[PDB]
Symmetry: D2
């Protein structure tokens, strides 16, 4: 059973979050109870602050609180390569990857013909003007039929502009053995094999 | 990440249990696409939970009233107290609708190894509720600690004219013996019941 | 995979549950790497089980003799019979050391939805064992079917005169009511054992 | 558990990779309700596989014949030799279908420090196979030693007359970068194939 509406209210809102079911929401409400008021406030404020300060970048649509995203601003960043991505989280992933100092672009999603979701529900337009010649457009969308489809659509679109278009490497992940690697992956890791030495 | 709004929100979510760095970020970005209302409703529910929930003076169960629902209910059985480890168990024994007595929440459990003795236990409020003609049910967990907590309570509550009982160790609903530790099955036998 | 023998091992292994196509293969490549004695000692172990194992004609527990270990042990409470579903059950309750009586292995539970009635479980050879002055401990599982079977066995056995018990429902050792479902906690609270007079 | 045959069979089964004590006991009781024919057909496949399966003297795949159907099949690419760690890897690439070439089974990876130099693998009998006009595709995993063994084979083959290639390190099929390892994403970006030149 559940009575104090405040507790019933917290369980609900918490349970509305991804990766957190009813049982876990309650587990969470009873932990917030044991916490000092300073924290609850700081959690609440942090939530509210961000919701206010956080907006999408006008150039690329990476998340920020300024006129331009830190990536767009930063002058030491390779201004000639744009890495198209599905979600702002991928920017972090490809950023904490210590191997890319270029510009990013965020379609806030993936194409999907099924649900009438087209290149108008995704930030594909604001990308075109950013693409010029002597530039490279790395397509880093997912690898689901969605990511695969979005990318090929992007390739088609960007083609007329004079930039080099590339797609990230389909392949076996690091720290695995062929035995537990999916069939279609292997076939791609194979057909996409890199030559380490030419006689 | 760079904007303080994000970093701070992450920071504050990292704290919450069942959530680490990566989840916090995931969460934040999820909250980013929610309409303000959703956020406001989450912020208030937190604050309203803090401002309103408090321990029941009589049983220490979490409530918003001067007395918890169980305690303010006159149709409840005043002659039995089911001592439990966490407030979440009162919910669990209540969803059972099989119990109409009273509870009592220790907000913890004896943990010698982790330096937890009775000092950190809160029984002060329990003692003055157990007289004679009453039954106390130790619905403490069944771990090495729970069983301890019960033992502690037994020796503690027994001097009062109370009859102390313990939740039955047995096989759980939907259980298939083979997939049930021996010790438990051993108990499920010792405590079986005549159905004929 | 072309060598027919390799193929067969795969297919033969794929028949065992818990093991599937891709999993059979792995095992097969694991065997290939083992010495001849390992493989010969696994092979002979299968043929020896088949050849020497069979249900106890009295209680249907698994055994390699005319009557099972339990049934033949003189120092056993021939007064009580604990009924279980699978033979592995006798292993558990025995590995429990709390029981010193006899058993009866049904080899399954009643399952209406799967067309499994009493005729497909060794229920019949259990009736002639039950008489007045005995106790039948229905220790079938605690699932919906496991319960249904218990009830059924109870109605059948009752008139015979023996006393009948059901294993105690309850909280398992080493847990907390948090990660314990309500249903259980309900019976677990109801079947509480008094630990001290008033 | 007392019948020596049930025990002996559990022991032997629980030796198999993937099945634990519990799982093994379960397989035993399943073997129980099975007919001799199956038990003999299983025990048959085992001993049979031990008898007929051996390592091919060319590419060390697995076969009954004097030479693996792969090496034997004259309809395969005679120019490429795909080096894998395990025979399973063969069947693993012989699924994606995108390969008609030859293979070379190493039967393990390097991982030196724990005492496993190249002399314990089948690298030696690979050398003569490689020649000018061919391509050696190093298909070892991507574990630490997976990449290690590859880097060894590379340095080792360089001199021979064939080109060397390494399987593509990258993002698997059916995934989002959010749920994809750091270094993988990194090697994914560095190993990005351009698809539209300007
Ligand atoms: Zn930007
Ligand atoms: Zn109360
Ligand atoms: Zn017997
Ligand atoms: Zn061969």
């Amino acid at each position: 059973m559940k009575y104090p509406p405040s507790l019933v209210s917290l369980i609900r809102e918490l349970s509305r979050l991804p990766g957190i079911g009813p049982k876990s929401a309650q587990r969470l409400a009873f932990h917030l109870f044991e916490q000092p008021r300073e924290d609850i406030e700081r959690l609440a404020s942090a939530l509210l602050e961000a919701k206010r300060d956080l907006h999408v970048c006008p150039i690329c649509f990476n998340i920020t609180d300024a006129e331009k995203c830190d990536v767009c601003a930063d002058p030491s960043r390779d201004q000639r390569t744009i890495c198209v991505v599905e979600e702002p989280g991928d920017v972090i992933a490809l950023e904490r990857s210590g191997e890319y100092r270029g510009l990013y672009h965020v379609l806030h999603g993936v194409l999907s013909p099924m649900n009438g979701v087209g290149p108008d529900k995704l930030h594909i337009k604001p990308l075109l003007p950013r693409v010029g010649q002597g530039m490279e457009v790395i397509l880093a969308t997912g690898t689901t039929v969605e990511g695969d489809a979005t990318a090929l659509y992007l390739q088609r679109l960007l083609e007329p502009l004079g930039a080099a278009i590339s797609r990230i490497a389909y392949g076996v992940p690091v720290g695995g053995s062929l035995e537990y690697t999916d069939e279609v992956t292997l076939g791609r890791a194979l057909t996409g094999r890199q030559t380490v030495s030419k006689p």
